[PDB]
Design a binder for this molecule. Structure first.
Ligand SMILES: *C(=O)[C@]1([C@@H](O)[C@@H]2C=CCCC2)NC(=O)[C@@H]2CCO[C@@]21C
Ligand SMILES: *C(=O)[C@]1([C@@H](O)[C@@H]2C=CCCC2)NC(=O)[C@@H]2CCO[C@@]21C
Lengths: 244, 244, 204, 233, 243, 196, 222, 250
């Protein structure tokens, strides 16, 4: 029969761990690092582009920062193609919520839904899990600025600052070292770049190897604005913060 | 490596399908059965091993009819044989229902062929453990066929399978050479009785019961009928006589 | 009985010089009974405007549907939808319900952000696209609207002039329709800006 | 060898064998003995009921399928319930639709075909029980032997289960004798008990231990247990 | 791990052994065939070998009439061959019903190739151990030869050969065309094309043929048919009166 | 509509008017009601043009696949496929079909499939609104084993009468001759059959 | 509606009026009833506009995919088979009545399909409420071996019959010529015999004529 | 019967690798070299027609396929896998876009559709990943010209120029030397021909090379006239002759 070739992607190890989830997480640890830092007046998402070439078109590229809603974005660490599958369903769920209640979906509700989908591949179906980890940066009128994280297991948690992908241990220690509750978006933007700068497995940290986004509530307006920095914009902020 | 013979639809490095070949072993281990094409019909005969005096004589019939003009006999796993005839019967009913005319032997053969070939395409099923000799009379003549577990089949002048297939084939080849003009149904019945008796030597240890059936344009009106009473004994004798 | 004559209401769109206008009444009734004088029938997704007459529940449902669809479109296409494209989205969305249609009379209005060209279009309840260059009417007072428009309309009117024209067409047609009126709103649209004006009319 | 070709019914061994089927046949041999024999007027079923403890009952081994048909089981009881239930439906169908009693030979063909399906597909398992079917139809008395392999044979008499070979040789000997016990059920039944006791060894057939069933010419398939079989011990 | 050789999944070298072993099966019949295009016809020759004296020679064939216009010769075990023939016929009939015109040879080929590509990708379907050579005189393309393998690959040919001694026939034909400089047998009658076909079959295989050693199929405008033992004999005689 | 099929010495002939109406309007005055389902198996269509076309298209498909596997089909087999479709879908079809074919062993054969989906093999058959008017004529003038010329004449006269009385019939008379010699198409214009 | 098709010595031409109506009201004074199925296979539609339109695009889409898959030019008989089997399946509920023409590798063709799924072939055809006015003209002027120019004239005259004599038809004449060896040429508004006369007065209102209650700017930029 | 393979055939190894994807990529590596170069007013994609026999008719086998009138594809890897992927891509451009918006999809979105199809063969039950890498070139009103690469994992990325297959490493290097953001279409075609030469062992002419471009609109390739807004396809495969003319100025 077929049984012979079934890897059994959803079973427990004698230690009570999920093989596939564990191996998927291992896969994620080799992915470009992504950072999420929450300030009092905004949120900062920064990611390091894994592998690059002189010929790679960066203006038309996006492999780590995706817009889910006009108030929610995610930073990706893992299989891009897997992330895109999940991102699209996340986008549909946000709209279903909007159409049903005529209110933008609360950040946690969207995260719990995406995580629940992941958890499914963990308990039934016999399919490999998604080799993906997300950092969610969003805003709603019940909790304001929020930062979340979800991994292959389907677990999610809230953070003031966090990272996923390669060298998270090093990144987390550096963040836990200089983070301060009363930070400001500009401060966080700088912290983020410094952290990546010290955890990169590459020579230097140039703009062509970064993606940047911020979710602020532009004082001169009263609404929330997401800003996915453009090549040139990253190049600028990279000089200003003193990394040239 | 190895293990190419554990799953049914697998190609071994030399391009073979071992399970189909092991199926053949089940066929060779079975009772011998034959078929003889005559000038206007076909004759079927088979060896019935008398396990004990407890078997009611003449009761456990092995030859089967399909529709009203086709006879089928087989060697190997009896149950697999019936399974195939059942399909053949549905196959024939369907054909008559749509086209009105009873199904032609060549058409009927391919129906059985495609079905058996189908059981060598997946590892979720097992090949048929029988070789089948079948045929009858139709719009243009008589037709004899033999179908192997591989789904392979061809039209025959004479055919045999099972324990004493070699003796049988040998006897059959003699008739083919000594009768380029064609054997008559009457003659084929006797000749058949002989071939089974002879071929019964490869199993001379157990006593047996002879069974014959035929389909002749002149002798049975093109309908498949069993040889019984006088005509039967007359053939049994013709054999018992030439067996010494 | 007629799903299109239960709630009442009208919508009209016109093309002018480098501009387009779309207007509607504000009534929502239940047969003879007036229920709401604030039921606006014009909506927009980016710079594309959509008016919808017919069964109110469907007007509401369709708006929610097109918001939903234009939102995902923006997320994937990374640009706002255009009048011509939206028009095709409306058409195929309605036809998809060919044998259980929404009882509405949609009207699209807008200016192509890249060509600057003005655009209006109408649809029957099963999506058939009517792409006129002058005007498009819809609702329980559509006959009256055709009469008003055919006479009052002339090509290349300036924004300020088209406003007067479209407003007079809407107003006088609504006053000959038992199921229309109770307020009106007119949208004057240009490449860069869009002005929305509420009109003063009979309340009977 | 075997170990690599006996993991499921869908696999042929290198010699053309079906081990799962054979392992099923083994469950029968481990089952209590039961006998069947017929004359020209009647058919009888004699079965040795087996008990767990001396505080337990002797599991029933005979099932009535219709007024003219019934069987005895050796092996997995649950599988006999399934197969007999299917035989009950088939007999019922023949009656309701064609107002015809199902031929014993036809029942045999139906059992064979149902058993066969469970020996060619992945996922299932062969039935692990043997059956002896007796019945009186339009062609007289009949006795059938059903093997999980799907092989069904018509006989004058036979036995299946542990030490069944004893009774089987006895019958193969007594043949010319009992086959003529026409018009005398008691004589046929006694001959049945004499064949079955040829497979004893452990104990001796007692009252709550012996089970007999008969069917024939003017006798609807009926089952006798306990006191009712006392006059045969 | 070692099962990457039982089902159709990649081996560490990016190979699909099951497809490779399927190719192996195609030579199991030890039969060779070749096809050539005429000026307005297409011919396919295939060795016919009937070992058993108990067989009815008339029922032994690896050539099939798929449609009124399409013929197909199969190199491989007969059961898989007949499975491919039935499917092709069904496919050919449906195409006509749905699109209102006869399915072109190249299209039927692509369709069968795609079906094969699938057994190459889905684990529950085994590939068929056969090579299909389709021929006809397409109403748009003219004489056509398209062949498909267990890999789901297919392409058109000026001429082609298939079987154990494929390479010999192929180089033989290649040479002839390097010489003639045209991509077809410049003959007006299919009879002569059939003769050319059989002739080179002999030269390349270095063997003589009787009327029962061959099997021939011809495709012309609006029709494809197979020749009889006698139609062949007449062919063998003609070639004899030249050597 | 007026259609008929007549068997004769050398085979069989099919005939029909060329009119399709939508009320009193003649939507088509040159319609071809003689449809080919196989080389020597044709049918006459009456009732719904849409239904009969769909039915025929399917029979042709079925016979094509039949040929691919079992060779040329018998006229009886073609009639059986038509029957299957008409009987099994009697609730949704309005199709009166006459099947006519030429076999070498059987020569000409005619099977008529009326509304309910029943099949009737006959020496000849007529159908369609116009047929009612020529029942008496045909019954009086039909003869078995007529020559090709006589048969063409019988059909020509019969149909011209049907066309004469039935407003639902008209245009030209089309015929299809099915014999061992092949397939012949015949057409007859108003100026010829009207004054017969 | 008035739509016609007319074959000529080396191709086919189809034409149609430009009136669109809702009951007795003219909704579109210049709609387009000529749709394309493939570059050289065009359709003229009558009946339910949404249906003729939707059906032309569905089969057109599939015809494109079929073309790409078979590496061949689409054939008229293919669009015809796909259209009729689709319409038949829907038992006339898809109110599409079409005249389908075009040129392909096998020649030039002219057919008609009805909502229920039946098809017809001819040298000249017409459908729609103008059907009878058009046909009257065709039965009066058609002849075999028409030149491209004659066919255009004939077809164009047939629609005029409908425009003038049928209330269900009006405005302009659209034509499309498909010639065996060339590109198909779509002639939108080939004839415009119904231009509206200059109005007797201008109804331009003096600004400020309309009473306004409230005014505001609408935000379009996100 | 019935596909009973409802579990993934591509799973994570302890190292975190996805075996079947890796192997699929290896298959891509053995495939004939193919490339794409973006110019300021067009895009060129090209590959070698590795005729598997001289009796084969190389024209009857296009490695360069038109997906939409403004989008084309080329690949490196398993030809049969590519063929079905093209059929599926042409259809999805319709079903998921043209039948909804009445226009063809923009290059990034169609690419995204193809990528999804490939990602699924990486996770769905009973299948193996596609053994190919595609280079898709196209144009659309709001994005201009673009070039994308899609690998077995389903991942895709935009390029100015790149190569895949056999000598991808060498070719990519040669491209980095000659590419600038001021190349005209003809320049890219030239550079493309040079790059491809280094990867070809034998004959190098318009019958052994396959090359197409996404450029201006070809009204002459529309098939009809009469609709101002319809100007023709931007995709155009070059002819054998057209290639040779450019090879002389090599
Ligand atoms: C004839 O039965 C008739 C034809 O229109 C029709 C057309 C083509 C083939 C089948 C026959 N059917 C009809 O409904 C009309 C009205 C009366 O009979 C018709 C002329
Ligand atoms: C014509 O048949 C007509 C058209 O409105 C319509 C419009 C576009 C394409 C199909 C044809 N159909 C109708 O229902 C109206 C009323 C009478 O005929 C129309 C004018």
């Amino acid at each position: 029969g077929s049984r012979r070739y079934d890897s059994r992607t959803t079973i427990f190890s004698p230690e009570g761990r999920l093989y596939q989830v564990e191996y998927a997480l291992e896969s994620i640890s080799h992915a470009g690092t992504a950072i999420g830092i929450m300030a009092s007046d905004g949120i900062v998402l920064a990611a390091e582009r894994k592998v690059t070439s002189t010929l790679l078109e960066q203006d038309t590229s996006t492999e780590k920062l995706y817009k889910l809603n006009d108030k929610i974005a995610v930073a990706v660490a893992g299989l891009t193609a897997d992330a895109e599958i999940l991102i699209n369903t996340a986008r549909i769920h946000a709209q279903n919520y909007l159409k049903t209640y005529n209110e933008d979906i609360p950040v946690e509700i969207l995260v719990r839904r995406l995580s629940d989908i992941k958890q499914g591949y963990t308990q039934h179906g016999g399919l490999r899990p998604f080799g993906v980890s997300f950092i969610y940066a969003g805003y709603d009128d019940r909790y304001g600025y929020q930062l979340y994280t979800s991994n292959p297991s389907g677990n999610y948690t809230g953070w003031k600052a966090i990272s996923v992908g390669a060298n998270t241990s090093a990144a987390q220690t550096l963040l836990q070292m200089d983070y301060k509750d009363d930070m400001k978006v500009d401060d966080a933007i700088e912290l983020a770049l410094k952290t990546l700068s010290k955890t990169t497995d590459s020579s230097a940290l140039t703009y062509d190897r970064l993606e940047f986004a911020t979710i602020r509530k532009g004082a001169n307006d009263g609404e929330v604005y997401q800003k996915i920095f453009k090549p040139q914009e990253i190049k600028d902020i990279l000089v200003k913060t003193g990394i040239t | 490596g190895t293990g190419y013979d554990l799953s049914n639809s697998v190609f071994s490095p030399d391009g073979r399908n071992f399970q189909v070949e092991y199926a053949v072993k089940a066929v060779e281990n079975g009772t011998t059965s034959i078929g003889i094409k005559c000038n206007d019909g076909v004759v079927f005969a088979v060896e019935k091993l008398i396990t004990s005096k407890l078997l009611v004589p003449q009761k456990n019939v092995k030859i089967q009819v399909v529709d009203r003009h086709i006879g089928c006999v087989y060697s190997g796993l009896i149950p697999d044989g019936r399974h195939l005839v059942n399909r053949g019967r549905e196959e024939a009913a369907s054909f008559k229902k749509l086209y009105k005319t009873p199904i032609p032997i060549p058409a009927f053969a391919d129906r059985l062929g495609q079905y058996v070939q189908a059981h060598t395409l997946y590892n979720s099923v097992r090949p048929f453990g029988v070789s089948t000799i079948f045929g009858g009379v139709d719009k243009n003549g008589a037709h004899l066929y033999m179908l192997e577990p591989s789904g392979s089949y061809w039209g025959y002048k004479g055919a045999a399978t099972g324990k004493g297939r070699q003796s049988a084939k040998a006897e059959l080849e003699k008739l083919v050479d000594h009768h380029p003009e064609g054997l008559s149904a009457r003659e084929a019945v006797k000749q058949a009785a002989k071939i089974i008796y002879l071929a019964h030597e490869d199993n001379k240890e157990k006593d047996f019961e002879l069974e014959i059936s035929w389909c002749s344009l002149s002798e049975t009106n093109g309908l498949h009928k069993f040889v019984k009473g006088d005509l039967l004994q007359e053939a049994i004798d013709f054999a018992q006589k030439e067996i010494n | 009985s007629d799903p299109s004559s239960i709630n009442g209401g009208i919508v009209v769109a016109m093309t002018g010089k480098d501009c387009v206008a779309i207007a509607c009444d504000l009534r929502l009734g239940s047969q003879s009974l007036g229920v709401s004088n604030k039921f606006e029938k014009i909506f927009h997704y980016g710079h594309v405007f959509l008016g919808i007459t017919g069964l109110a529940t469907d007007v509401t449902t369709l708006n929610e549907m097109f918001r939903y669809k234009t939102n995902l479109y923006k997320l994937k296409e990374e640009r706002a939808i255009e009048p011509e494209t939206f028009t095709q989205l409306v058409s195929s969305s309605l036809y998809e319900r060919r044998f259980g249609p929404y009882f509405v009379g949609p009207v699209v209005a807008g200016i192509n952000s890249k060509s600057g060209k003005p655009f209006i279009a109408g649809f029957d309840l099963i999506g058939c696209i009517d792409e006129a260059k002058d005007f498009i009417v819809s609702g329980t007072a559509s006959d009256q609207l055709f009469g008003m428009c055919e006479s009052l309309y002339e090509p290349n009117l300036e924004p300020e002039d088209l406003f007067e024209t479209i407003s007079q067409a809407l107003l006088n047609a609504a006053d000959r329709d038992a199921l229309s009126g109770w307020g009106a709103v007119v949208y004057i649209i240009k490449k860069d800006e869009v002005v929305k004006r509420y009109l003063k009319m009979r309340q009977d | 060898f075997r170990n690599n070709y006996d993991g499921d019914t869908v696999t042929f061994s290198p010699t053309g064998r079906l081990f799962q089927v054979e392992y099923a046949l083994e469950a029968i041999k481990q089952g209590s003995v039961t006998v069947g024999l017929r004359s020209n007027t009647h058919a009888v079923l004699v079965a040795l009921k087996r008990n767990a403890d001396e505080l337990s009952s002797y599991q029933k081994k005979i099932i009535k399928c219709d007024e003219h048909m019934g069987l005895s089981l050796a092996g997995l009881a649950p599988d006999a319930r399934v197969l007999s239930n299917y035989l009950r439906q088939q007999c019922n169908y023949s009656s309701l639709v064609f107002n015809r009693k199902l031929a014993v030979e036809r029942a045999g063909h139906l059992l064979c075909d149902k058993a066969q399906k469970n020996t060619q597909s992945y996922g299932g398992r062969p039935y692990g029980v043997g059956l002896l079917i007796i019945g009186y139809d339009k062609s007289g008395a009949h006795l059938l032997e059903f093997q999980p392999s799907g092989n069904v044979t018509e006989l004058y008499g036979t036995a299946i289960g542990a030490r069944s070979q004893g009774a089987k040789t006895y019958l193969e000997r007594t043949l010319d004798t009992f086959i003529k016990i026409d018009g005398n059920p008691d004589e046929l039944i006694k001959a049945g008990v004499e064949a079955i006791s040829q497979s004893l060894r452990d104990e001796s057939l007692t009252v709550d231990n012996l089970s007999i069933a008969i069917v024939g010419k003017d006798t609807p398939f009926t089952i006798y247990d306990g006191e009712a079989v006392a006059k045969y011990i | 791990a070692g099962y990457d050789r039982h089902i159709t999944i990649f081996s560490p070298e990016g190979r699909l052994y099951q497809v490779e072993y399927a190719f192996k099966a195609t030579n199991q019949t030890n039969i060779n065939s070749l096809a050539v295009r005429g000026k307005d016809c297409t011919v396919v020759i295939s060795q016919k070998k009937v070992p058993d004296k108990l067989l009815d020679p008339t029922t032994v064939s690896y050539i099939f009439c798929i449609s009124r216009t399409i013929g197909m010769v199969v190199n491989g075990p007969i059961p898989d061959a007949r499975n491919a023939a039935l499917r092709a016929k069904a496919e050919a009939a449906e195409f006509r019903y749905k699109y209102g015109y006869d399915m072109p040879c190249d299209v039927l080929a692509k369709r069968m190739a795609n079906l094969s590509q699938i057994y190459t990708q889905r684990a529950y379907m085994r590939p068929l151990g056969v090579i299909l050579t389709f021929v006809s005189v397409d109403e748009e393309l003219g004489p056509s030869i398209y062949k498909t393998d267990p890999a789901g690959y297919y392409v058109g040919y000026k001429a082609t050969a298939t079987g154990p001694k494929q390479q010999e026939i192929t180089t033989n034909l290649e040479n002839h065309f390097k010489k003639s400089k045209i991509d077809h047998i410049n003959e007006e009658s299919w009879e002569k094309v059939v003769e050319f076909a059989i002739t080179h079959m002999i030269d390349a295989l270095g063997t003589e043929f009787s009327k029962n050693d061959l099997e021939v199929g011809v495709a012309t405008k609006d029709k494809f048919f197979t020749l009889s033992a006698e139609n062949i004999e007449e062919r063998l005689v003609a070639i004899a009166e030249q050597d | 509509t007026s259609i008929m099929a007549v068997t004769f010495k050398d085979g069989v002939i099919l005939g029909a008017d060329s009119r399709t109406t939508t009320g009193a309007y003649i939507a088509n005055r040159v319609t071809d009601k003689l449809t080919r389902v196989h080389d020597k198996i044709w049918c006459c269509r009456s009732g719904s043009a849409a239904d009969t076309q769909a039915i025929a298209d399917i029979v042709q498909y079925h016979l094509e696949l039949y040929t691919s596997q079992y060779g040329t089909p018998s006229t009886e087999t073609a009639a059986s496929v038509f029957k299957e479709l008409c009987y099994e879908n009697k609730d949704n079809l309005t199709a009166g079909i006459i099947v006519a074919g030429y076999d070498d062993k059987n020569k000409g054969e005619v099977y008529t499939i009326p509304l309910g989906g029943s099949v009737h093999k006959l020496p000849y058959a007529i159908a369609g609104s116009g047929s009612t008017f020529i029942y008496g004529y045909c019954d009086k003038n039909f003869r078995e084993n007529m020559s090709k010329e006589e048969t063409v004449d019988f059909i020509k006269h019969s149909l011209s009468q049907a066309i004469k009385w039935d407003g639902s019939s008209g245009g030209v008379i089309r015929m299809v001759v099915l014999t061992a010699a092949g397939v012949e198409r015949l057409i007859f214009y108003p100026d010829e059959y009207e004054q017969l | 509606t008035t739509i016609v098709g007319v074959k000529f010595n080396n191709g086919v031409v189809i034409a149609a009026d430009t009136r669109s109506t809702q009951g007795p009201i003219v909704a579109d004074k210049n709609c387009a009833k000529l749709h394309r199925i493939s570059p050289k296979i065009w359709c003229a539609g009558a009946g339910t506009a949404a249906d003729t339109e939707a059906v032309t695009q569905l089969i057109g889409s599939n015809i494109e995919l079929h073309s790409l898959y078979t590496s061949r030019e689409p054939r008229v008989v293919s669009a015809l088979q796909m259209l009729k089997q689709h319409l038949f399946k829907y038992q006339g509920h898809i109110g599409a009545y079409l005249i389908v023409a075009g040129v392909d590798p096998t020649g030039s063709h002219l057919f008609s399909i009805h909502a229920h799924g039946s098809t017809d072939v001819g040298y000249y055809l017409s459908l729609g409420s103008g059907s009878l006015a058009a046909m009257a003209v065709l039965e009066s002027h058609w002849k075999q071996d028409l030149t491209k120019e004659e066919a255009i004239k004939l077809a164009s005259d047939a629609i005029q019959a409908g425009i003038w004599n049928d209330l269900g038809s009006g405005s302009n004449v659209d034509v499309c010529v498909m010639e065996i060896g060339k590109d198909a040429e779509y002639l939108r508004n080939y004839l415009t015999p119904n231009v509206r006369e200059e109005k007797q007065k201008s109804y331009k209102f003096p600004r400020g004529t309309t009473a306004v209650l409230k005014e505001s700017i609408v935000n379009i930029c996100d | 019967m019935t596909d009973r393979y409802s579990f993934s055939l591509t799973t994570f190894s302890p190292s975190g690798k996805l075996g079947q994807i890796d192997y699929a990529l290896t298959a891509v590596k053995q495939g004939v070299t193919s490339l794409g170069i973006k110019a300021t007013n067009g895009v060129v994609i090209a590959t070698e027609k590795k005729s598997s026999s001289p009796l084969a008719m190389s024209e009857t086998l296009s490695k360069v396929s038109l997906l939409t009138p403004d989008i084309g594809a080329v690949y490196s890897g398993m030809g049969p896998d590519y063929r079905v992927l093209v059929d599926k891509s042409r259809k999805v451009a319709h079903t998921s876009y043209k039948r909804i918006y009445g226009e063809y999809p923009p290059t990034k979105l169609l690419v995204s559709e193809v990528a999804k199809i490939m990602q699924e063969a990486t996770q769905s039950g009973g299948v193996r990943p596609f053994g190919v890498s595609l280079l898709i070139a196209g144009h659309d009103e709001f994005n201009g010209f673009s070039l994308y690469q899609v690998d077995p994992s389903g991942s895709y990325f935009p390029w100015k120029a790149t190569a895949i297959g056999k000598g991808s490493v060498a070719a990519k290097t040669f491209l980095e030397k000659r590419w600038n953001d001021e190349l005209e279409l003809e320049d890219a075609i030239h550079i493309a021909l040079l790059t491809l030469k280094e990867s070809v062992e034998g004959e190098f002419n318009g019958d052994t090379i396959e090359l197409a471009i996404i450029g201006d609109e070809n009204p002459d390739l529309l098939g009809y006239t009469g609709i101002p807004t319809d100007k023709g396809p931007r995709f155009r495969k070059l002819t054998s002759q057209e290639i040779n003319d450019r090879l002389e100025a090599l």
